[PDB]
């Protein structure tokens, strides 16, 4: 009773819905912003698009809602729909690639002397620079800048919790990636009067090892038929034609591979590294098989009286066997041996190279997890 109807009344009589919990132009209302992440569902590492979900915990004080006996001293804590406070119509300078879901228009926790607690989980369409640099083992970092899209920091100050909180705090276990750390730094670019956005850093690490495995098999298994086509010459010289069949076959195979590679990066591309040199490794088996094909080509051919008849017989046979013996002199196997071992150098050299680069790529550019 104690002026309850009165209080109650006066409050709703004088209280202003559309007003800011501050008095004039000054230090403003110090709103607390801090989100406990739920998990993330889709990383479009290719366009640098980020759809995650977290809690929008906001909290500041409404010294305009401090109650009295019944709602203050009666029930120190009571729930009341928002819709009555300035809400950070927050957009993300890079990210905020789309609207809020479970972000605004939801109830809030209002304390006795005016404290306000609003904890809503939400899904948000963002876009961070995971750029086409989300695959190097050295990976990269990003700028996630949150802030309102009609308000300018003049009638409120924004403030954070931790900066180490981490993003693996609610990292998706469903992620083909991994994370090292999440930096959180408060910002106010001076290119705009409006103090604004906060930059949040993603020192992301995404190592999904699954198909590069059977990709290796081609390179090496194709090599099987490759070393084979380079081995088949002094193995079965008649490989002559069958050889060409091999490369038709070998080339179509690698071209189909050419088919799956562009359409697969089509959703998760970054530096060429792997492709850069396998591209070379490609060109390598490609041309090596084709010049060996020219190795194959280079051969212009390969690619008394009684006794007289006898004598005429003696000369017939012998005469042309030298001729076909000439073909021997012409297609001997010197090259095959020499370049099948130049094949030895080439393929085992260029092989242990990307082997190496790849080797160097996973270990060397790994520690910049920062």
């Amino acid at each position: 009773s104690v002026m309850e109807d009165t209080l109650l009344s006066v409050l709703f009589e004088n209280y202003n819905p559309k007003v800011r919990p501050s008095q004039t132009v000054g230090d403003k209302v110090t709103v607390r912003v801090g989100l406990t992440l739920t998990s993330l569902l889709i990383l479009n590492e290719k366009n640098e698009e980020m759809t995650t979900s977290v809690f929008l915990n906001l909290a500041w004080t409404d010294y305009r809602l401090q109650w009295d006996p019944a709602a203050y001293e009666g029930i120190k804590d009571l729930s009341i729909p928002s819709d009555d406070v300035w809400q950070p119509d927050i957009v993300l300078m890079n990210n905020n690639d789309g609207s809020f879901e479970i972000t605004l228009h939801v109830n809030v926790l209002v304390q006795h002397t005016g404290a306000v607690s609003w904890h809503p989980s939400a899904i948000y369409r963002s876009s961070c620079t995971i750029k086409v640099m989300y695959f190097p083992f050295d990976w990269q970092n990003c700028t996630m800048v949150f802030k309102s899209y009609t308000y300018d920091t003049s009638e409120v100050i924004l403030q954070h919790a931790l900066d180490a909180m981490i993003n693996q705090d609610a990292f998706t276990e469903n992620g083909q990636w991994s994370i090292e750390h999440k930096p959180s730094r408060k910002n106010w670019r001076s290119d705009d009067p409006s103090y604004e956005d906060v930059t949040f850093y993603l020192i992301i690490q995404r190592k999904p090892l699954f198909y590069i495995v059977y990709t290796i098999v081609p390179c090496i298994l194709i090599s099987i038929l490759a070393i084979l086509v380079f081995y088949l010459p002094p193995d079965a010289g008649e490989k002559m034609s069958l050889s060409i069949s091999a490369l038709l076959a070998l080339t179509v195979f690698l071209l189909l591979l050419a088919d799956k590679v562009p359409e697969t990066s089509l959703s998760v591309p970054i530096i060429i590294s792997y492709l850069m040199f396998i591209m070379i490794l490609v060109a390598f088996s490609v041309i090596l098989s084709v010049v060996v094909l020219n190795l194959h080509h280079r051969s212009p051919n390969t690619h008394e009286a009684v006794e007289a008849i006898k004598y005429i017989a003696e000369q017939l046979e012998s005469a042309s066997e030298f001729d076909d013996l000439k073909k021997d002199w012409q297609y001997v196997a010197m090259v095959a041996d020499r370049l099948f071992l130049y094949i030895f150098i080439t393929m085992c050299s260029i092989g242990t190279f990307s082997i190496f680069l790849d080797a160097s790529h996973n270990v060397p550019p790994d520690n910049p997890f920062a």
């Binding site: 034609s241 038709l248 179509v252 490609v286 094909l293 009286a305 008849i309």
Partner: protein, 370 residues
């Protein structure tokens, strides 16, 4: 205090939001547009659709918003939310594919005098020419008109604000590149009606396309195929033993050319390139076609290639000799003298066609690169 409540309430009462600050029958409501694309998110030259960042600077005056010491004296310039304002139905003429995004419920600023600005952070859906003339090396100028939508120059007039580039905030992630962009004003009166119609801002986007990755993959299997067909020439004249062997290649390669066709027309369908680009491939690819068919039909062009005891000896020797003849006949079929002709016949052809393909390639690259 200072007429506190009397101040605020009076203002609400006699003021109709929907009213347009019409001032006598003349100048119309003078309202100016000023678009600053902060940045672009994505574009589809094929479907000529773009999602872009726009901060619309909208200006106009409402002499009804002028004040005295009890509104301007309170705090010079202040923040009043939109609603109460008459929002020009802005519209991109041949564009407009989408609603202005974040135009709604934003705020504006009123001066001690009245002058108001409405500059809400937009990003929207666009629709501009690309025609099959945008992907050219010689580009096309995206004609984009902007201006008042349902009001005439007698009720209202949209005017421009300034010059500024489109590559000022052009997307570096675009598969295209900018030349220049200009925008000049205009008033459109129609021979239809004797009346004076709306005003408009006309954008002109002059940019040339094609990211270079494409460039390399395609022309190299061509010089690739060039060498196999090059081999298609040299293989036969230096070795007609694997004519059919090459039969294989002819199959494996035009099919390679066939499947490359699925890939690049979808590219074609993925990105609108001026068809006159297509003829490059047309004759080029098709000569691979006319040349083969002749080269290999010719490759193919050849009939079959692609005392008494003493007398016994002479009836027998005579048998060996006319078959001797016969052998020479079929060889008199596959000569190695003109396969050399076709070699230089066409290689000059290829160095002609090729250098002719390089011709227009080089030529308008003498125009584009400029």
């Amino acid at each position: 205090s200072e007429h506190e409540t009397r101040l605020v309430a009076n203002l609400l009462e006699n003021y109709n939001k929907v009213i347009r600050p019409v001032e006598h029958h003349t100048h119309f409501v003078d309202i100016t547009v000023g678009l600053q694309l902060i940045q672009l998110i994505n574009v589809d030259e094929v479907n000529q659709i773009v999602e872009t960042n726009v901060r619309l600077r909208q200006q106009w005056i409402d002499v009804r918003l002028r004040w005295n010491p009890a509104d301007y004296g309170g705090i010079k310039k202040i923040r009043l939310p939109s609603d109460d304002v008459w929002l020009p139905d802005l519209v991109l003429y041949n564009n407009a594919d989408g609603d202005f995004a974040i135009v709604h419920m934003t705020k504006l600023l009123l001066d001690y005098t009245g002058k108001i600005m409405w500059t809400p952070p937009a990003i929207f859906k666009s629709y501009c020419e690309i025609i099959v003339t945008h992907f050219p090396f010689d580009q096309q100028n995206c004609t984009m008109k902007l201006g008042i939508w349902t009001y005439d120059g007698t009720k209202v007039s949209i005017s421009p604000e300034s010059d500024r580039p489109d590559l000022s905030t052009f997307m570096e992630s675009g598969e295209w590149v900018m030349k220049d962009y200009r925008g000049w004003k205009h008033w459109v009166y129609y021979t239809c009606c004797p009346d004076t119609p709306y005003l408009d801002i006309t954008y002109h986007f002059i940019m040339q396309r094609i990211p270079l990755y494409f460039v390399v993959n395609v022309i190299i299997p061509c010089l690739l195929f060039s060498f196999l067909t090059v081999l298609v020439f040299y293989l036969p004249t230096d070795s007609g033993e694997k004519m059919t062997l090459s039969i294989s290649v002819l199959l494996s390669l035009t099919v390679f050319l066939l499947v490359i066709v699925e890939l690049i027309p979808s590219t074609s369908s993925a990105v609108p390139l001026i068809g006159k680009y297509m003829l490059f491939t047309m004759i080029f690819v098709i000569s691979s076609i006319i040349v083969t068919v002749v080269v290999i039909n010719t490759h193919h062009r050849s009939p079959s290639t692609h005392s008494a005891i003493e007398g016994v000896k002479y009836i027998a020797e005579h048998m060996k000799s006319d078959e001797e003849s016969s052998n020479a006949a079929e060889e008199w079929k596959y000569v190695a003298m003109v396969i050399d002709h076709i070699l230089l016949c066409v290689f000059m052809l290829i160095c002609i066609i090729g250098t002719v393909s390089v011709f227009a390639g080089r030529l308008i690259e003498l125009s584009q690169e400029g």
